[PDB]
Amino acid sequence: GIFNTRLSRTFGYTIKRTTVKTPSWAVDMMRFNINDFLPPGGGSNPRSVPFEYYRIRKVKVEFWPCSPITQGDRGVGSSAVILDDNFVTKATALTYDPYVNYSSRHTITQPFSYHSRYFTPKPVLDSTIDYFQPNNKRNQLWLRLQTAGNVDHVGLGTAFENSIYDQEYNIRVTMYVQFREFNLKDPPL
């Protein structure tokens, strides 16, 4: 019983100002979990979408700027796809862009420019070995939609060039999911 749908979530991210003169970059990570998109249900149905299995097909991360088009001290960054839960260490002012030479690098124009990334994440099945599957719609694993313990999906790391002014963003993540085995429970009343 397949049901392809779309789930979204919005949150903020700010790159604080720095008095440093050099071009330094601010590094951070981004994971994706389905608990943040799918709330708990009620009653005999533990989740709000009554299905048993799921598998995330795609994610769309949108960096919607919060800064005016008149803001100066512009910069240039990079967003890369990291499917293994080993990101570059979080840094406030690093002397280089680590994600620049990555094959999945897209340039981030800053601060007042929109940046989208559309990709297929991978689940963290074993963080010790960090193995994942290649892209195959027919062979992608089905995970279970747990009650409160779903596994973290992974796949984006960023590097933003710091500035004299604060750079704020409203980040909207949209997960395109595919469920299976409609499992609604209908007790009497």
Ligand X SMILES: O=C(O)[C@@H]1O[C@@H](O[C@H]2[C@H](O)[C@@H](NS(=O)(=O)O)[C@@H](O)O[C@@H]2COS(=O)(=O)O)[C@H](OS(=O)(=O)O)[C@@H](O)[C@@H]1O[C@H]1O[C@H](COS(=O)(=O)O)[C@@H](O[C@@H]2O[C@@H](C(=O)O)[C@@H](O[C@H]3O[C@H](COS(=O)(=O)O)[C@@H](O)[C@H](O)[C@H]3NS(=O)(=O)O)[C@H](O)[C@H]2OS(=O)(=O)O)[C@H](O)[C@H]1NS(=O)(=O)O
Footprint on this chain of ligand X (rule: CB under 6 A): 86, 88-89, 98, 127-128
Q: Is 100 in the site for a second copy (CB under 8 A)?
A: yes
CA 14 vs CA 19, 160, 161, 171, 175: distances in Å: 16, 10, 12, 10, 22
Q: How far is CA 132 from the centre of its chain?
A: 17
Two tokens, residue 133: 């599957």
Residue 91's nearest CA partner among 158, 157, 28, 17 is: 28
Q: What, of a second copy, ligand X, none, does residue 89 touch, CB below 5 to 8 Å by kind?
A: ligand X
Measured CA to CA, the distance from residue 78 to residue 8 in angstroms comes to 23
Q: Closer CB to ligand X, residue 15 or residue 88?
A: 88
* Window 42-61: residues binding a second copy (CB under 8 A): 42-45, 48-50, 52-53
Q: What, of ligand X, a second copy, none, does residue 119 touch, CB below 5 to 8 Å by kind?
A: none
Shortest Å, Cβ 106 to a second copy: 13
Residue 98's φ and ψ, nearest 5 degrees, are -70, -30
Q: Closer CB to ligand X, residue 89 or residue 139?
A: 89
Report the DSSP beta bridge partners of residue 65: 169
Binding mask 58-97 for a second copy (x = CB under 8 A): ------xxxxxxxxxxxxx-------x-x--------xxx
Q: Is 151 in the site for a second copy (CB under 8 A)?
A: yes
Q: Is 20 in the site for a second copy (CB under 8 A)?
A: no
Q: Closer CB to a second copy, residue 30 or residue 47?
A: 47
Contact 181, 42 (CB under 8 A): no
Whose CB is nearest to ligand X?
128
